[PDB]
């Protein structure tokens, strides 16, 4: 039996924020020379935001302390609509009736409330009240893989059932514009987004149709001594992320050994891979991932594009890249083989081997 | 023939189970008096003698001289999550070890670690520390389940269940850790006073594995026969969880017990029917001991003898409500002492999660 991504959709809040403008706007808020620098190296052109953190209204609110609760409600306010629309689209193409969707996995690291977006999706879409649900929080930029794994196991355990995977990330809702350098960095890289996957099980013999993605092998790797690499926390005025200057190096030395072993277990080499869905969390995250594998820089083309158009949307980013690859073939071969990976908190390398069926 | 692939035919079994809580024992009577000290504080004594709780454990002493200066300050949420991590790690590492202690499973055999909580939230969390502390494989699969409340042990267990049945050679480790004492605030409203009189601290872990139906399992093993979930119509306001500047909180509706009463019977009855059973066939009712009103209505809904809820009352009296952890404390008591002489006791366990979802399972405890 094989696990398949039979449906996929992505969405984003309508508001388009221009980095060139964001830079100017944020700078206005001494050593304001820095801001223009960090926004130039971001390699981001635009990112979507559910909320304009620099809006005259949110400005007063932003400067206030003890506002996480209000911010979590804001998260819910804007997340529900987006996740519903993106989930509806992920299913729009399949015939599956509500009774065939037995699991809903919701992943987020930017909002905490119960009942949450998962409950809203079940009611809004008309899914079974008896559908299984799991909410994956604080697994960061790599959550889509942890989520997909849960759906993969589910579907393999219940071959006649389908799973819905929804990743929602609304960073704009936690904007604070603090003084430190790390805060200035994430505020220049993070964006808003949503994506959903419809997973199913299929016989090996079944001839799948074009566009379908077979999840061949998933993998995880807690990297020794890198715990300070990616930190997530909850502050009185919002959720934060604290990236370590050592992260890109942790990435340079951690990606290659992991990927190489996993491929070898599948009789493949790095030079055999057609697609490299590298998590576009930032110029250096991509930069060092490519350097670790020693592959051509162009192989990360799809990853840079996503970063350029949406910035880092956390767990969502990886699925946008996958969509790009499902939409635009990189060769004329039937079936393209790719590898996807992103990085989680304890600094865990998370990924999968996958096949995109071209014809 | 594009039919669906054949389903795994193995059954998930809880092969290891451990329980644990911080060492500090808080006496409910003393708690009432000490909280009462914080016009007409008559409100405290009532909302305490009606709790049906004798003791509960706490990693932190909320009324301690130190914390009473920190307890009243705003914007302390970040420090409280660090407080959570500091106390959660030692306790979770210890309980996880106790659950694996008797099994011959080598580290490479444990392929999944599910961690559930609704009282923490931190970057590398408790899950990472467990793998490092117990020397689990760096490549183990991990899933963190937050804010699914009092019924999270079921969502977590279901995840381990699918994993194990999909990969029959591996085992899964489930860990529920709840540290309420870390979020103590002592606000004015009844809901807050009520929560602070009911919530306690605790930890529990399960070791899951796949088993072939003809295998003669040994006494104490628990077979997870069937699981179920049910979102109850128009009950969103029943169990509300949120994050405040001074800590995580839970807001319960006056209508909750009414949602429980009319929600339990229909779901439990439908699920048992799927397994050729009725409510009267069941030995053991592991009802989530969230509080007197929750146990109360669950039993009425089922139309069963109050004595069939002894295990649940016992846990509530000795530990208070430890959220996701409580259901597992309940299961351990049923394991340690048979309720009848029949070989193989059949039971149903269930708890309530936000949105108000009935979460539960049908199970078998092998006596001989
Ligand atoms: C789990 C980590 C959450 C990090 C949230 C960071 C929120 C601030 C950055 C995103 C919004 C930027 C808005 C702007 O600067 O124009
Ligand atoms: C996810 C729900 C979190 C609820 C946290 C409630 C914290 C206050 C109650 C627990 C501490 C009680 C301390 C006491 O009064 O003795």
XYZ file of C-alpha atoms and ligand atoms in Angstrom:
759
model
C 0.000 0.000 0.000
C 1.035 3.536 -0.905
C 0.205 6.898 0.729
C -0.918 9.594 -1.741
C -1.468 13.335 -1.707
C -4.537 13.226 -3.926
C -5.524 16.824 -3.311
C -3.728 20.059 -2.499
C -4.480 23.759 -2.177
C -2.825 26.881 -0.852
C -4.194 30.187 0.311
C -3.125 33.476 1.733
C -4.728 36.555 3.289
C -5.490 39.136 0.543
C -3.386 42.057 1.883
C -0.161 42.401 -0.128
C 2.721 43.979 1.794
C 5.674 45.325 -0.205
C 9.077 44.724 1.413
C 10.514 47.912 -0.085
C 7.714 49.774 1.622
C 7.785 47.635 4.762
C 11.472 48.525 5.075
C 10.795 52.269 4.877
C 7.714 51.979 7.088
C 9.494 49.906 9.756
C 12.603 52.106 9.699
C 10.603 55.181 10.686
C 9.775 53.444 13.983
C 19.441 56.431 16.154
C 20.501 53.235 14.405
C 17.559 52.956 12.016
C 20.220 52.225 9.406
C 20.034 48.537 10.307
C 16.429 47.951 9.198
C 17.107 48.892 5.542
C 19.999 46.407 5.672
C 18.094 43.417 7.031
C 15.199 44.055 4.649
C 17.575 44.138 1.667
C 19.209 40.798 2.423
C 15.841 39.135 3.111
C 15.467 38.329 -0.579
C 11.738 38.796 -0.128
C 9.697 40.932 -2.524
C 6.279 40.458 -0.951
C 4.526 38.590 1.834
C 0.839 38.359 2.690
C -0.618 39.482 5.995
C -4.042 38.993 7.595
C -3.390 42.174 9.543
C -1.438 45.355 8.793
C 0.618 45.609 12.021
C 1.566 49.174 11.072
C -2.045 50.311 10.621
C -2.968 53.340 12.768
C -5.279 51.097 14.798
C -2.887 48.214 15.481
C -0.088 50.673 16.256
C -1.483 51.594 19.675
C -2.423 47.962 20.320
C 1.069 46.786 19.364
C 2.773 48.983 21.922
C 0.544 47.557 24.644
C 1.675 44.739 26.953
C -0.386 41.733 28.042
C -2.243 41.238 24.767
C -1.622 37.606 23.759
C -5.201 36.620 24.515
C -6.589 39.319 22.251
C -4.010 38.314 19.653
C -5.060 34.669 19.866
C -8.663 35.748 19.162
C -7.400 37.828 16.225
C -5.631 34.716 15.026
C -8.887 32.750 15.153
C -10.845 35.570 13.515
C -8.642 35.592 10.449
C -7.599 31.937 10.415
C -11.050 30.329 10.224
C -12.039 31.944 6.883
C -8.687 31.192 5.244
C -8.442 27.571 6.432
C -12.043 26.875 5.398
C -11.511 28.238 1.895
C -8.192 26.415 1.467
C -9.670 23.164 2.785
C -12.688 23.459 0.471
C -10.342 23.824 -2.478
C -8.116 20.906 -1.490
C -11.230 18.734 -1.662
C -12.939 20.526 -4.573
C -11.425 18.137 -7.106
C -12.149 14.840 -5.377
C -15.461 12.954 -5.232
C -14.892 11.976 -1.610
C -18.004 12.542 0.449
C -17.847 13.912 4.008
C -18.180 10.376 5.357
C -14.858 9.308 3.815
C -12.729 11.890 5.618
C -11.811 10.292 8.919
C -9.022 12.546 10.134
C -8.266 16.239 10.314
C -4.754 17.283 11.366
C -4.284 20.959 12.154
C -0.764 22.436 12.456
C 0.126 25.908 13.731
C 2.758 27.692 15.806
C 1.155 31.152 15.615
C -2.119 30.804 17.509
C -3.532 28.954 20.523
C -7.299 28.670 21.212
C -9.812 25.905 21.893
C -12.084 25.108 20.285
C -9.887 26.095 17.354
C -9.698 26.221 13.570
C -10.108 22.442 13.338
C -13.540 22.559 14.977
C -14.517 25.436 12.687
C -13.428 23.484 9.599
C -15.469 20.392 10.517
C -18.638 22.458 10.958
C -18.034 24.826 8.048
C -17.288 22.026 5.593
C -19.916 19.622 6.858
C -17.477 16.909 7.860
C -18.538 14.058 10.158
C -18.901 15.026 13.864
C -17.234 11.685 14.536
C -14.112 12.563 12.517
C -10.755 12.115 14.266
C -8.772 15.269 15.051
C -5.260 16.126 16.233
C -3.848 19.601 16.715
C -0.084 19.895 16.228
C 1.252 23.069 17.858
C 4.732 24.555 18.213
C 6.468 22.142 15.849
C 7.444 25.176 13.793
C 8.543 25.427 10.187
C 8.583 21.644 9.767
C 5.095 20.886 11.174
C 3.599 19.934 7.765
C 5.827 16.825 7.813
C 4.857 15.850 11.370
C 1.237 16.432 10.350
C 1.532 14.516 7.088
C 3.133 11.618 8.935
C 0.106 11.420 11.201
C -2.160 11.378 8.135
C 0.085 8.805 6.457
C -0.142 6.388 9.399
C -3.901 6.978 9.671
C -4.609 6.233 6.005
C -2.375 3.152 6.082
C -4.352 1.964 9.115
C -7.719 2.810 7.480
C -7.184 2.334 3.687
C -10.812 3.134 2.884
C -10.581 6.516 4.621
C -9.027 9.886 3.789
C -7.181 12.445 5.879
C -7.225 16.227 5.692
C -4.039 18.069 6.643
C -4.319 21.799 7.297
C -1.418 24.097 8.124
C -2.280 27.679 9.123
C 0.213 30.307 10.007
C -0.663 33.947 10.723
C 2.496 35.660 11.976
C 1.229 39.218 11.363
C -1.052 38.664 14.323
C 1.937 38.411 16.686
C 3.828 41.471 15.389
C 5.489 43.576 18.098
C 8.440 45.344 16.439
C 10.754 44.992 19.443
C 14.295 46.366 19.840
C 16.533 43.276 19.657
C 18.199 42.091 16.455
C 16.525 38.690 16.288
C 13.082 40.307 16.524
C 14.010 42.700 13.735
C 15.086 39.689 11.656
C 11.940 37.556 12.030
C 9.715 40.614 11.554
C 11.378 41.104 8.174
C 11.122 37.433 7.106
C 7.808 36.016 8.410
C 4.571 36.044 6.410
C 1.001 34.708 6.555
C -0.321 31.663 4.742
C -2.334 28.451 4.703
C -2.218 25.123 2.884
C -4.089 21.851 3.006
C -3.513 18.278 1.817
C -5.982 15.467 1.150
C -4.258 12.131 1.782
C -5.359 8.635 0.824
C -4.094 5.065 0.561
C -3.701 3.137 -2.657
C -2.475 -0.236 -3.924
C 1.005 -0.290 -5.475
C -0.513 -1.613 -8.696
C -2.952 1.277 -9.103
C -1.935 3.557 -11.953
C -2.202 7.030 -10.473
C -3.217 10.051 -12.536
C -1.001 13.097 -13.296
C -0.412 15.541 -10.460
C -0.795 12.964 -7.701
C 2.102 12.798 -5.243
C 3.215 9.523 -3.679
C 4.783 9.867 -0.211
C 7.535 7.234 -0.522
C 9.424 7.626 2.736
C 9.304 10.107 5.600
C 12.207 10.833 7.956
C 13.138 12.790 11.080
C 16.474 13.584 12.744
C 17.125 15.265 16.059
C 20.539 16.892 15.468
C 23.017 16.586 18.342
C 23.747 19.827 20.195
C 21.597 22.313 18.303
C 18.788 22.815 20.850
C 19.420 26.562 20.816
C 18.987 26.571 17.034
C 15.248 27.323 16.876
C 13.331 28.612 19.881
C 9.601 29.232 20.167
C 7.940 30.863 23.122
C 4.815 32.651 24.243
C 5.217 36.240 25.461
C 2.635 38.467 27.173
C 2.340 40.351 23.895
C 2.654 37.547 21.400
C 4.271 34.374 20.173
C 7.995 34.630 19.333
C 10.732 32.701 17.597
C 14.415 33.015 18.486
C 16.792 31.908 15.771
C 20.412 31.168 16.651
C 23.275 32.598 14.620
C 24.565 29.000 14.600
C 21.439 27.701 12.792
C 22.689 27.921 9.177
C 25.839 26.074 10.219
C 23.709 23.472 12.047
C 21.935 23.178 8.702
C 25.084 22.951 6.615
C 26.388 20.015 8.608
C 23.055 18.354 9.373
C 21.221 18.116 6.035
C 23.671 16.017 3.979
C 24.231 13.015 6.301
C 20.481 12.682 6.939
C 19.350 12.934 3.317
C 22.181 10.697 2.039
C 21.331 7.867 4.454
C 17.611 8.022 3.711
C 18.229 7.961 -0.042
C 20.692 5.089 0.261
C 18.014 3.146 2.133
C 15.947 3.671 -1.007
C 18.751 2.832 -3.434
C 19.143 6.450 -4.521
C 21.852 9.130 -4.503
C 21.642 12.899 -4.236
C 22.412 13.061 -7.982
C 19.284 10.983 -8.646
C 16.870 13.592 -7.297
C 14.920 15.765 -9.744
C 13.274 18.093 -7.241
C 14.529 19.668 -4.040
C 11.696 21.189 -2.035
C 13.905 22.985 0.484
C 12.039 24.896 3.193
C 12.301 28.568 2.179
C 12.698 29.894 5.697
C 15.254 32.506 4.654
C 18.239 33.147 2.330
C 20.689 31.319 4.597
C 18.370 28.388 5.346
C 18.183 27.768 1.615
C 21.796 28.812 0.993
C 23.169 26.268 3.476
C 20.752 23.477 2.525
C 21.989 23.644 -1.064
C 25.607 23.841 0.110
C 25.183 20.835 2.366
C 23.896 18.622 -0.475
C 26.432 20.105 -2.874
C 23.790 20.414 -5.576
C 23.371 23.069 -8.247
C 22.038 26.375 -6.906
C 19.293 26.412 -9.532
C 17.746 23.256 -8.055
C 16.456 25.524 -5.290
C 14.695 27.769 -7.797
C 11.193 26.862 -6.586
C 12.253 27.411 -2.967
C 13.549 30.958 -3.564
C 10.421 31.916 -5.519
C 8.159 31.024 -2.620
C 10.333 33.000 -0.205
C 10.261 35.961 -2.600
C 6.466 35.995 -2.938
C 5.390 35.110 0.613
C 8.355 35.246 2.958
C 8.534 32.517 5.599
C 5.009 31.215 6.337
C 6.350 28.507 8.701
C 4.852 24.998 8.208
C 2.906 26.300 5.206
C 5.956 27.156 3.091
C 6.872 23.573 2.299
C 3.446 22.883 0.738
C 3.597 25.976 -1.508
C 6.899 24.704 -2.928
C 5.324 21.286 -3.497
C 2.435 22.917 -5.367
C 4.862 24.774 -7.632
C 6.549 21.465 -8.445
C 3.222 19.715 -9.085
C 2.275 22.601 -11.387
C 5.585 22.987 -13.284
C 7.523 19.906 -14.438
C 11.336 20.148 -14.229
C 11.953 17.504 -16.904
C 10.150 15.430 -19.502
C 10.330 12.208 -17.519
C 7.203 10.375 -16.444
C 7.275 10.555 -12.642
C 9.684 13.014 -11.026
C 11.408 12.082 -7.771
C 11.930 14.747 -5.150
C 13.027 15.270 -1.574
C 11.450 17.779 0.807
C 12.743 18.867 4.179
C 12.386 21.606 6.761
C 13.731 22.280 10.218
C 11.927 21.963 13.536
C 12.706 23.340 17.075
C 15.126 20.992 18.869
C 16.541 21.402 15.442
C 15.099 18.310 13.987
C 15.474 17.712 10.267
C 12.028 16.715 8.947
C 11.309 15.512 5.425
C 10.168 12.933 2.859
C 11.016 11.153 -0.388
C 8.228 11.683 -2.923
C 7.221 10.982 -6.500
C 5.187 13.396 -8.608
C 3.416 11.616 -11.443
C 3.763 13.474 -14.715
C 2.116 10.978 -17.085
C -9.665 -3.193 -9.670
C -8.681 0.034 -7.871
C -10.277 -1.077 -4.578
C -8.769 0.247 -1.334
C -5.758 -1.687 0.001
C -6.550 -4.332 2.637
C -6.442 -2.947 6.223
C -3.813 -4.039 8.766
C -5.365 -6.846 10.772
C -3.475 -6.357 14.024
C -4.832 -4.871 17.265
C -3.154 -2.129 19.328
C -2.237 -3.084 22.883
C -1.146 -0.921 25.827
C 1.838 -3.000 26.890
C 3.253 -0.604 29.447
C 1.640 1.995 31.691
C 3.138 4.298 34.320
C 1.810 7.051 36.529
C 3.376 9.998 38.310
C 2.978 13.384 39.937
C 5.131 15.907 41.791
C 5.832 14.986 45.431
C 4.134 17.984 47.043
C 0.807 16.964 48.579
C -1.708 19.797 48.952
C -4.518 19.168 51.406
C -7.855 20.424 50.057
C -9.036 21.647 53.472
C -5.797 23.582 54.044
C -5.980 24.852 50.448
C -9.480 26.228 51.073
C -8.360 28.078 54.212
C -5.216 29.475 52.588
C -7.116 30.614 49.495
C -9.894 32.047 51.654
C -7.350 34.466 53.093
C -6.653 35.960 49.664
C -15.270 41.350 52.097
C -17.321 38.149 51.969
C -14.874 35.355 51.088
C -17.677 32.898 51.917
C -17.460 32.008 48.242
C -14.296 29.964 48.799
C -15.527 27.493 51.469
C -18.550 26.460 49.355
C -16.645 26.087 46.098
C -14.285 23.764 47.982
C -16.403 21.509 50.151
C -18.348 20.740 46.980
C -15.229 19.693 45.031
C -15.154 16.119 46.365
C -11.355 16.377 46.420
C -9.191 15.427 49.418
C -5.715 16.002 47.931
C -3.848 16.882 44.723
C -0.189 17.234 43.706
C 1.624 20.367 42.628
C 5.069 21.001 41.139
C 4.802 24.529 42.476
C 3.198 25.918 45.648
C 1.016 28.730 44.228
C 0.583 30.343 47.649
C 4.269 30.042 48.538
C 5.892 33.174 49.951
C 7.963 33.519 46.777
C 5.241 33.007 44.160
C 2.698 35.227 45.924
C 4.668 38.217 44.605
C 4.992 36.692 41.127
C 1.425 35.360 41.134
C 0.000 38.865 41.127
C 2.128 40.377 38.378
C 1.008 40.811 34.760
C 2.803 39.605 31.642
C 4.374 36.540 33.281
C 3.213 33.985 30.692
C 6.711 33.428 29.213
C 8.265 32.768 32.628
C 5.465 30.354 33.503
C 6.143 28.257 30.379
C 9.798 28.121 31.463
C 8.454 27.168 34.876
C 6.464 24.466 33.089
C 9.517 23.154 31.270
C 11.662 23.151 34.404
C 9.236 20.893 36.309
C 7.703 18.967 33.410
C 10.971 17.478 32.118
C 12.051 15.634 35.314
C 8.551 14.255 35.840
C 7.970 13.167 32.227
C 11.417 11.585 31.921
C 10.777 9.641 35.123
C 7.276 8.377 34.210
C 8.289 7.478 30.636
C 11.077 5.329 32.099
C 8.659 3.591 34.475
C 6.411 2.672 31.525
C 9.287 1.102 29.589
C 10.949 -0.485 32.662
C 9.448 -3.968 32.378
C 9.500 -4.317 28.560
C 12.326 -5.936 26.518
C 11.979 -3.365 23.776
C 15.301 -1.956 22.656
C 15.603 1.758 21.815
C 15.536 1.173 18.061
C 12.070 -0.372 18.413
C 10.442 2.826 19.652
C 9.513 4.741 16.506
C 6.997 7.317 17.783
C 6.696 9.638 20.752
C 3.416 11.494 21.258
C 3.396 14.296 23.786
C 0.158 15.920 24.935
C -0.364 18.976 27.151
C -2.575 22.038 27.513
C -0.542 23.735 30.262
C 2.888 24.311 28.685
C 4.158 25.379 25.224
C 7.936 25.840 24.751
C 10.525 25.718 21.916
C 12.459 22.550 22.187
C 9.813 21.029 24.455
C 9.409 18.130 26.825
C 9.356 15.673 23.899
C 12.905 16.533 22.797
C 14.223 16.101 26.372
C 12.595 12.654 26.684
C 14.398 11.333 23.582
C 17.694 12.804 24.806
C 17.194 11.700 28.405
C 16.039 8.129 27.669
C 18.469 7.723 24.818
C 15.776 7.170 22.232
C 16.707 7.096 18.532
C 17.539 10.519 17.049
C 15.279 9.533 14.150
C 12.181 8.760 16.199
C 8.941 10.266 14.882
C 7.448 12.902 17.161
C 4.065 14.590 17.407
C 3.124 17.273 19.937
C -0.582 17.579 20.802
C -1.564 20.835 22.485
C -4.905 22.290 23.615
C -7.025 19.196 23.101
C -7.669 19.400 26.840
C -8.898 16.727 29.232
C -9.467 14.247 26.402
C -5.994 14.516 24.820
C -4.852 11.088 26.015
C -7.376 9.657 23.542
C -6.229 11.762 20.546
C -2.637 10.898 21.439
C -3.407 7.194 21.909
C -5.184 7.098 18.557
C -2.062 8.439 16.887
C 0.088 5.713 18.462
C -2.565 3.190 17.472
C -2.438 4.010 13.765
C 1.376 4.122 13.763
C 1.789 0.747 15.419
C -0.783 -1.000 13.228
C 0.801 0.510 10.117
C 4.327 -0.507 11.241
C 3.748 -3.789 13.239
C 7.408 -4.130 14.274
C 7.580 -0.858 16.177
C 6.332 0.602 19.444
C 5.049 4.031 20.342
C 5.500 6.036 23.520
C 2.632 8.286 24.631
C 3.206 10.933 27.278
C 0.610 13.198 28.862
C 2.034 15.828 31.211
C -0.104 18.412 32.920
C 1.177 21.173 35.181
C -1.738 23.363 36.220
C -0.095 24.719 39.405
C 2.279 26.559 37.087
C -0.593 28.694 35.780
C -2.076 29.685 39.161
C -3.450 33.244 39.166
C -6.346 33.367 41.660
C -8.760 35.697 39.847
C -12.140 36.930 41.194
C -14.696 35.080 39.026
C -16.353 31.752 39.992
C -14.941 29.918 36.997
C -11.436 30.878 38.087
C -12.131 30.027 41.734
C -13.653 26.734 40.593
C -10.739 25.822 38.319
C -8.259 26.641 41.074
C -10.146 24.373 43.451
C -10.220 21.481 40.976
C -7.089 21.396 38.808
C -3.970 19.471 39.812
C -0.621 18.259 38.435
C 0.247 14.878 36.975
C 1.937 12.745 34.358
C 1.215 9.456 32.635
C 2.737 7.427 29.835
C 1.694 4.476 27.679
C 3.805 2.130 25.571
C 1.865 0.877 22.547
C 2.567 -2.049 20.251
C 0.784 -4.035 17.547
C -0.336 -7.572 18.341
C -1.700 -10.503 16.309
C -5.250 -11.466 17.380
C -4.353 -15.106 18.140
C -1.559 -14.120 20.538
C -2.357 -15.170 24.101
C -1.596 -11.909 25.892
C -0.414 -11.888 29.498
C -2.456 -10.550 32.464
C -2.486 -6.776 32.790
C -2.294 -6.111 29.047
C -4.936 -3.729 27.701
C -6.386 -4.198 24.213
C -7.553 -1.018 22.454
C -10.533 -2.488 20.620
C -12.162 0.653 19.221
C -11.900 4.439 19.517
C -14.472 7.186 18.876
C -14.898 10.957 18.677
C -18.057 13.058 18.657
C -18.320 16.809 18.278
C -21.535 17.756 20.110
C -23.839 20.165 18.271
C -23.954 23.716 19.615
C -21.575 23.212 22.532
C -18.602 25.345 21.477
C -18.875 27.401 24.657
C -18.563 24.280 26.777
C -14.791 24.006 27.274
C -12.753 27.065 26.364
C -8.970 27.145 26.550
C -6.904 30.267 26.080
C -3.595 31.947 26.773
C -3.571 34.975 29.088
C -0.677 37.333 29.822
C -0.409 35.751 33.259
C -1.001 32.150 32.284
C -3.061 29.582 30.447
C -6.673 29.285 31.537
C -9.779 27.153 31.011
C -13.288 28.637 30.939
C -16.126 26.182 31.626
C -19.784 26.838 30.837
C -22.639 26.444 33.326
C -24.190 24.312 30.559
C -21.260 21.816 30.440
C -22.895 19.195 32.671
C -26.001 19.409 30.504
C -23.871 18.806 27.386
C -22.270 15.811 29.059
C -25.557 14.238 30.131
C -27.217 14.427 26.741
C -24.031 13.753 24.818
C -22.634 10.656 26.524
C -25.411 8.049 26.202
C -25.995 8.426 22.436
C -22.297 8.247 21.486
C -21.452 5.400 23.881
C -24.537 3.467 22.789
C -23.827 3.854 19.080
C -20.161 2.821 19.477
C -20.943 -0.223 21.615
C -23.549 -1.289 19.051
C -20.821 -1.212 16.387
C -19.064 -3.756 18.585
C -22.123 -5.875 19.355
C -22.556 -4.500 22.857
C -24.948 -2.476 25.014
C -24.183 -0.369 28.081
C -25.210 -3.198 30.466
C -22.471 -5.499 29.117
C -19.652 -3.248 30.328
C -17.367 -4.003 33.315
C -15.437 -0.810 34.154
C -16.302 2.721 33.189
C -13.179 4.870 33.012
C -15.012 8.179 33.112
C -12.738 11.201 32.988
C -12.682 12.463 36.607
C -12.794 16.143 35.707
C -14.921 17.002 38.711
C -18.037 15.941 40.632
C -20.463 17.369 38.027
C -18.660 15.658 35.127
C -18.636 12.176 36.684
C -22.177 12.780 37.992
C -23.773 13.488 34.604
C -21.714 10.879 32.767
C -23.140 8.196 35.050
C -26.722 9.482 34.813
C -26.466 9.724 31.020
C -25.518 6.038 30.928
C -28.159 5.024 33.472
C -25.570 3.018 35.390
C -24.911 2.328 39.073
C -22.855 5.030 40.801
C -20.602 2.281 42.096
C -19.332 1.569 38.587
C -17.631 4.977 38.812
C -15.625 4.233 41.968
C -12.263 4.292 40.157
C -13.014 7.741 38.747
C -14.185 9.193 42.068
C -11.073 7.795 43.731
C -8.689 9.534 41.306
C -10.544 12.875 41.628
C -10.369 12.616 45.412
C -6.654 11.747 45.489
C -5.446 13.937 42.627
C -8.107 16.414 41.588
C -8.366 16.955 37.821
C -5.057 16.541 36.005
C -6.589 17.061 32.581
C -5.394 14.556 29.932
C -3.502 12.563 32.550
C -6.508 11.561 34.684
C -8.002 9.015 32.334
C -4.737 7.052 32.500
C -4.580 7.160 36.321
C -8.066 5.683 36.159
C -7.040 2.865 33.829
C -4.092 1.911 36.078
C -6.379 1.340 39.087
C -8.611 -0.953 37.022
C -5.511 -2.818 35.895
C -4.150 -3.260 39.428
C -7.462 -4.583 40.782
C -10.037 -6.736 39.000
C -13.663 -5.612 39.389
C -14.951 -9.149 38.897
C -13.759 -12.729 38.496
C -14.270 -13.016 34.746
C -11.149 -13.515 32.638
C -11.061 -10.377 30.466
C -12.914 -7.298 31.668
C -14.442 -5.091 28.975
C -14.451 -1.364 29.530
C -15.210 1.992 27.994
C -13.191 5.104 28.714
C -14.060 8.637 27.679
C -13.259 12.255 28.405
C -14.298 15.671 27.115
C -12.291 17.957 24.864
C -12.893 21.555 23.703
C -15.622 22.340 21.184
C -16.997 19.702 23.447
C -16.013 16.504 21.785
C -16.559 13.168 23.457
C -13.296 11.283 23.181
C -13.034 7.648 24.192
C -12.339 3.981 23.533
C -13.685 0.459 24.052
C -11.077 -1.767 25.705
C -10.247 -5.161 27.212
C -8.084 -5.822 30.291
C -6.705 -9.351 30.394
C -7.044 -10.877 33.852
C -5.831 -14.365 32.917
C 6.264 30.793 16.245
C 6.991 32.081 15.850
C 6.001 33.224 15.619
C 6.739 34.497 15.202
C 5.756 35.645 14.965
C 6.491 36.895 14.480
C 5.509 38.049 14.257
C 6.204 39.277 13.667
C 6.735 39.027 12.252
C 5.612 38.871 11.222
C 4.850 40.175 10.980
C 5.750 41.255 10.373
C 4.962 42.537 10.094
C 5.870 43.650 9.569
O 6.976 43.840 10.080
O 5.507 44.370 8.643
C -5.443 24.036 29.999
C -6.118 24.470 31.301
C -5.116 25.138 32.246
C -5.799 25.528 33.558
C -4.795 26.129 34.544
C -5.471 26.468 35.872
C -4.452 27.009 36.877
C -5.077 27.221 38.258
C -5.561 25.910 38.886
C -4.412 24.966 39.252
C -3.569 25.494 40.414
C -4.379 25.556 41.712
C -3.542 26.128 42.858
C -4.344 26.159 44.160
O -5.304 26.923 44.279
O -4.039 25.426 45.097
